[PDB]
Design a protein around this ligand. Structure first.
Ligand SMILES: [Mg+2]
Ligand SMILES: [Mg+2]
Ligand SMILES: [Mg+2]
Ligand SMILES: [Mg+2]
Ligand SMILES: [Mg+2]
Lengths: 514, 78, 173
RNA sequence: AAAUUGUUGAAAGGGAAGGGCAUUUGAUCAGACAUGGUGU
RNA sequence: GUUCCUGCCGAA
RNA sequence: CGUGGAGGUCAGUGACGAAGCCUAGACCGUAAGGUCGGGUCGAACGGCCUCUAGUGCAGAUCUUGGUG
């Protein structure tokens, strides 16, 4: 067995930069294989000097791709990097086929940003050989998605996703049908347990995977439509299972299967995807296939919201409600959500006076899905539930704040609200509900005075879409109110993060002295 | 009906299908007791460990080259 | 007069939204409005309030029902169409449900020949799931969607068609 | 607080709900040798 | 009345 | 094997979620059971050496409430 010496690595690098040969490449790659397999397993090479090992890693990842390219220079064709036909290419292709899973092991063992960047770059200069394989291209896109899924550093996730875009947009044929599958499967099974720490990271994962679906208008439609259907299967399995008498699997508590964060993560990611693809600018006066999936997504979400009208899962309703509001904002589709909200306004929490008041911490409505059975029937929980509910009404009826149809979108709601306000016992709730009522009437009066000067009827869609294009949405009475409220909410979340961040900083201080 | 005749062979007893005996681990110091016995033993992080400690244990285990029986537990589900 | 007053009131009853018997209420509304063709202002007021109530409902079958009724009430009372020339309909034209959108478009355009009477138990969520899981058995995948006339295809299933004509492969089984 | 009763909503089904068995058609998931070396 | 699981020694 | 009590010990574990309970999930043990995963739970508790207490069912007289 040859022993790695600082001389031998130096000579291999010496002749790498000038006149390399396939023998040298196989030797380097075999040494690399030993280097990466030292902890995890005959081998011709032995490694004893950290200097030699580090030099081997350096020269391999930074220059073996360079020599590989120089031997078999690829040519750009229709924006894609494609190898030519020839014997020498095939010999080099087997060599990259003998380097690929060492890169895979490095990918699976990423722990920091710069190592991720180096491995991803070296992998980048070896796509055109590994596109010819599917045990490697799949595991490649499966591994980097694994890194994109499990890293706790936002920079590492950014690097992984930038790699996914750069490689995917070049080729689009072998990878794109696997990138989307792997990413959304991450959102199914290998989903990150939610917490105030992981929210920006998972939000980036969703806001990122949304872009990938939008790149290919047709193929995305092929993928998401299948996966959303998978959700529907679970949705249909739990509804039937709860309703029927069969003691097969958990008739009484089947909610566990579908009332999970992973499922809500799914339905949020789909709303983000459709919103991204359906934006008016990306539409550009051109219909996109993803718009036709709006109806399935809305049906699934509405079917999930109504499956339990219990206080234990009101936070779950709120999140999907915000998602639907986003979808309607971006696409302009008319989602009915007030019937749901008013239907919850008959509950024992929105209606009956609080029983206990232990003075626990305020519930994290944004970043939780469940009440945890201690906040049930408490002053804090009622006060926070209503705090969310009022702002949700504000958002939903701020969508149409400047439309001509707002008066008649408001009338049935103000009447029902006054019915509930006049019959509701809880003082604080009546105060909050009241505020929304008068501001709704105020914006109704505003739109009426602005509409009295209109000469075109309801049929003229072109002019109807032009109504008050000069006026900003936030200048309306419901906008000017709710926008400010949004700030009064947004700042709060900031002060949470700018607080929690410090806690960890303080925590770090302790291990300094431990 | 259970009885001694059903007893498993000693050489194969207390062995997972991966071939590694499971050893409970609480902290990094207990992990380091399995430094070389990577072939014979695989670590298993205890149920009561917090998420912040589990990532450190996983990193140290990868550095040592010791197989963890239950990774992605409380960092992922199932 | 008192009956029509109570009906105009009950249109704003909040419990109506979650009532299983919305179909009986639909039929009653149609019969009442048909019987009141002479009072053009009253029937127009019911039409306006019907659309007001519909804008905030979640049951699709009921909304398609109201639109079909309004289309038919337009035939007996053509003066109802004057309201479209003399605002809510824009929202239903932009409704998430394709069937509701098509019904609204037909009511605005007046193109009534392509409307079958909507049937309750259709458009309901469980029925949509039964289609969408592709296993009804008294299936969607079994029919071959490569060759189905575009206008013949019902609005409800258009997205299905797209996927199948994109998928090829297991399009017809 | 259980246990118990009643109105409303969803689903399935048939006069009971109901199971087990067989066939049928589908949908969906996992499925390494990253085989050590040499040769042109 | 029976007496957590396994094993052992053993009349008549 | 399991349940408590006490002494000692693991510079043990813990809001980045402790104890308790469930888990027709994975691994281990012939088994009593143990470990992990998940769910539930939401503030502290566990492992280990020693001594000390201490393992699940059956059935009758009937009694009470409640329902015919
Ligand atoms: Mg546990
Ligand atoms: Mg029914
Ligand atoms: Mg003790
Ligand atoms: Mg247990
Ligand atoms: Mg066994």
């Amino acid at each position: 067995k040859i022993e790695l010496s600082l001389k031998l690595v130096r000579k291999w690098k010496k002749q790498l930069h000038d006149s390399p040969s396939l023998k040298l490449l196989r030797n380097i790659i075999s040494a690399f294989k030993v280097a990466v397999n030292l902890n995890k397993e005959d081998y011709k090479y032995a490694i004893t000097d950290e200097k030699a090992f580090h030099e081997l890693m350096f020269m391999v990842l930074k220059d073996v791709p360079q020599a590989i390219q120089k031997m078999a220079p690829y040519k750009i064709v229709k924006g894609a990097r494609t190898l030519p036909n020839g014997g020498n290419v095939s010999r080099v292709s087997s060599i990259v086929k003998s380097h690929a899973g060492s890169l895979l092991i490095l990918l699976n063992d990423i722990t920091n940003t710069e190592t991720a960047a180096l491995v991803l770059h070296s992998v980048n200069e070896l796509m055109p050989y590994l596109l010819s394989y599917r045990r490697i291209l799949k595991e490649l896109i499966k591994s980097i998605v694994g890194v994109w899924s499990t890293t706790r550093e936002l920079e590492t996730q950014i690097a992984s996703f930038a790699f996914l875009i750069n490689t995917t947009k070049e080729f689009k044929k072998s990878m794109l049908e696997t990138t989307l599958k792997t990413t959304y499967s991450t959102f199914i099974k290998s989903c990150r347990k939610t917490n105030m720490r992981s929210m920006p990271l998972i939000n980036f994962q969703k806001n990122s995977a949304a872009e990938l679906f939008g790149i290919d208008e047709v193929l995305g439609y092929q993928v998401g439509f299948e996966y959303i259907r998978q959700l529907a299967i679970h949705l249909r399995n739990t509804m039937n299972a709860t309703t029927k008498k069969s003691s097969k699997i958990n008739s009484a508590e089947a909610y566990k299967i579908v009332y999970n964060w992973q499922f809500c993560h799914s339905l949020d990611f789909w709303s983000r995807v459709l919103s991204f693809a359906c934006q008016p600018e990306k539409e550009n006066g051109s219909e996109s296939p993803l718009r036709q999936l709006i109806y399935p997504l809305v049906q699934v979400t509405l079917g999930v919201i109504r499956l339990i009208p219990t206080p234990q899962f009101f936070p779950l309703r709120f999140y999907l409600i915000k998602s639907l509001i986003r979808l309607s904002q971006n696409s302009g589709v008319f989602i009915p959500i007030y019937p749901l909200l008013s239907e919850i306004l008959t509950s024992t929490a929105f209606t009956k006076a609080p029983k206990k008041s232990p003075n626990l911490a305020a519930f994290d409505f944004e970043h939780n899905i469940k009440c945890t059975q201690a906040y049930l029937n408490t002053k804090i929980y009622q006060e926070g539930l209503s705090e969310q509910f009022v702002d949700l009404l504000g958002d939903y009826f701020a969508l149409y704040c400047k439309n001509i149809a707002f008066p008649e979108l408001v009338t049935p709601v103000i009447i029902s609200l006054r019915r509930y306000i006049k019959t509701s016992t809880n003082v604080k709730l009546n105060k909050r509900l009241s505020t929304v009522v008068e501001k709704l009437n105020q914006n109704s009066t505003f739109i009426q005075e602005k509409r009295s000067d209109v000469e075109f009827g309801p049929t003229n869609k072109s002019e109807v879409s032009r109504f008050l294009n000069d006026v900003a949405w936030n200048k309306t009475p419901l906008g000017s109110y709710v926008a400010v409220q949004r700030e009064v909410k947004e700042e709060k979340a900031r002060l949470m993060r700018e607080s929690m961040e410090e806690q960890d900083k303080e925590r770090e201080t302790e291990e300094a002295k431990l | 009906q259970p009885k001694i005749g059903y007893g498993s062979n000693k050489k194969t007893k207390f062995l997972s299908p991966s071939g590694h005996k499971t050893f409970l681990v609480a902290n990094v110091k207990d992990l380091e007791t399995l430094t070389m016995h990577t072939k014979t033993y695989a670590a298993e992080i205890a149920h009561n460990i917090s998420a912040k400690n589990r990532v450190v244990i996983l990193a140290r285990a990868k550095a040592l080259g010791i197989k963890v029986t239950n990774p992605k537990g409380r960092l992922a589900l199932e | 007069d008192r009956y029509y007053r109570t009906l105009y009131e009950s249109l704003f009853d909040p419990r109506l939204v979650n009532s299983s018997k919305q179909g009986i209420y639909l039929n009653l509304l149609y019969k009442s409005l048909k019987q009141d063709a002479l009072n053009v202002e009253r029937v127009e007021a019911f039409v306006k309030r019907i659309l007001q109530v519909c804008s905030h409902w979640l049951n699709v079958g009921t909304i398609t029902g109201f639109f079909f009724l309004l289309i038919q009430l337009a035939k007996t009372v053509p003066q109802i169409k004057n309201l479209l020339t003399n605002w809510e309909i824009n929202n239903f034209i932009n409704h998430f449900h394709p069937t509701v959108k098509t019904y609204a478009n037909a009511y605005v355009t007046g193109e009534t020949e392509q409307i079958a009477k909507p049937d309750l138990g259709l458009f309901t969520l469980s029925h949509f799931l039964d289609r969408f899981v592709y296993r009804s058995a008294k299936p969607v995948n079994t029919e071959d969607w490569l060759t189905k006339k575009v206008e013949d295809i019902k609005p409800e299933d258009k997205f299905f068609y797209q996927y199948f004509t994109t998928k090829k492969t297991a399009d017809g089984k």
